[PDB]
Amino acid sequence: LHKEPATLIKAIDGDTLKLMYKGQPMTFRLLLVDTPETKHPKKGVEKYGPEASAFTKKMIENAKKIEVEFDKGQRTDKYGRGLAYIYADGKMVNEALVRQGLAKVAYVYKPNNTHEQHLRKSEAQAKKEKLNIWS
């Protein structure tokens, strides 16, 4: 796997962002993580939703460099969102959210599962520390 550059357009919520990638606006969905939703139609804002959204927004807006890393499988979902691991100054946003107890590790879909074990280690530490979603 290889990291490519991208530029922020807009942070949409905790796990969805609009970036400029290879010259075009594209929506990205963060691979392997589920963040509580803010714009969820059924039962409005979920708990930790605004916080997960603020954490990704801060991390991405304050960064010097944003990179996008596709996994081994399909690179877009059925809604046309890029499926990637996103790095802000070399730090993976997907992992940072799980580490702070602001996301759960998603149901995984082989072969887009390269960083699953690493994220599962971070989630188990956040559970052990009782952070946010886990308190």
CATH number for the domain spanning 127: value is 2.40.50.90
Catalytic residues: 29, 37, 81
Q: Which long-range contacts (CB under 8 A, 24 or more apart) does 59-63 make?
A: 59/88, 59/91, 59/93, 59/96, 60/8, 60/11, 60/17, 60/86, 60/88, 60/93, 61/8, 61/11, 62/88, 63/8, 63/88, 63/89
Phi, psi at residue 127, to the nearest 5°? -65, -55
What is the extent of the structural domain holding 134?
A: 1-135
Structural determination approach: X-ray
Number of domains present in the structure of the chain: 1
* Annotated binding-site residue numbers for Ca(2+): 15, 34-35
Strand-pair category, 16-21 with 82-88: unpaired
Is residue 17 within 8 A of residue 56, CB to CB? The reply is yes
* Annotated binding-site residue numbers: 15, 34-35
Report d(CA 115, CA 47) in Å as an integer.
26
Is residue 75 within 8 A of residue 81, CB to CB? The reply is no
- Amino acid identity of residue 19, one-letter, is L
Report d(CA 70, CA 90) in Å as an integer.
15
